[PDB]
Amino acid sequence: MGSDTVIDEKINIPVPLGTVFSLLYGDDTSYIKKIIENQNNFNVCDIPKFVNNAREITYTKKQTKCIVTETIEHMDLNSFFMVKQIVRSPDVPYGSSFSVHTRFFYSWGDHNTTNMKVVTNVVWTGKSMLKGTIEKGSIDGQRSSTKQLVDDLKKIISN
Amino acid sequence: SDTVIDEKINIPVPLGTVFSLLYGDDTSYIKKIIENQNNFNVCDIPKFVNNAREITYTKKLKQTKCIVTETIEHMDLNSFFMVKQIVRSPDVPYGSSFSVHTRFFYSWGDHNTTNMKVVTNVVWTGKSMLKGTIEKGSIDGQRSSTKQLVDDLKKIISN
8 A cells, every 4th residue: 555556567559759749748639638538537628738847637537526637757759758647536535635646657669669657656645743743754864865865976976 | 745855956977877876786886875874784785686676774863774675667868767765664663654755867967967856755554444445446447547548549549
């Protein structure tokens, strides 16, 4: 529980990265609108064009409302792009306390195709004081280590 | 949720140099980096095998044992590579119930340099039936939605 599931890492779409990007994330949102409707969703709202590498999509699942954010995390149509999707269900039990995170890896595949990997986990929020104390120590310690790592890394390369 | 530890870091050498220093088969650099962060009893660092390695050390406070799993989640030294670090501390209070997951995003920086971003989630685990039911339905649902996404993508392309 809480760990990642590799939903699938043996996906290949037989067209280049830029085509898969255009279909799923491009300026013509008709393709992704239908795809969403084919997954037993309806009343999909007008798909915003990407702005600041993000867009928010609302629809109804078969019944409950879903709010989905998609964030482009890396964008190299010659080699690799990566999108993180976060799906919220505000009206289900504890829906304000969890979301479903899915990262989509799109990487150059043999013969100019697109390899796809899909990884998901469920992220719980909700601020238990005990959890909150442990998290603050964990994040403060990682901030300290990361600053030391970057400092040492730069000293290593400078000689 | 996803706490950005650091951001907009630039290391003025190429992606491959950063990779080699932190993750290459000469593990002496990363051993020294770890030892420089108030850590001792650092094992001789294994090289990555099958995109994973395990690192054990004890940390100053008195002292507590850390078991770190690093996994290479993508590696393209011409564009982007990403390593997930999971730090477990089974000897601290609640250490069997949480772990610290940090993702290190390395991307091609201007003029053949390395840009670096670091994001942490504290993951809580622990046999909750309530959360376990939501966890399974979520992963089942994304598994269903992803298979439909891929099928629809191949139909769009083959038409």
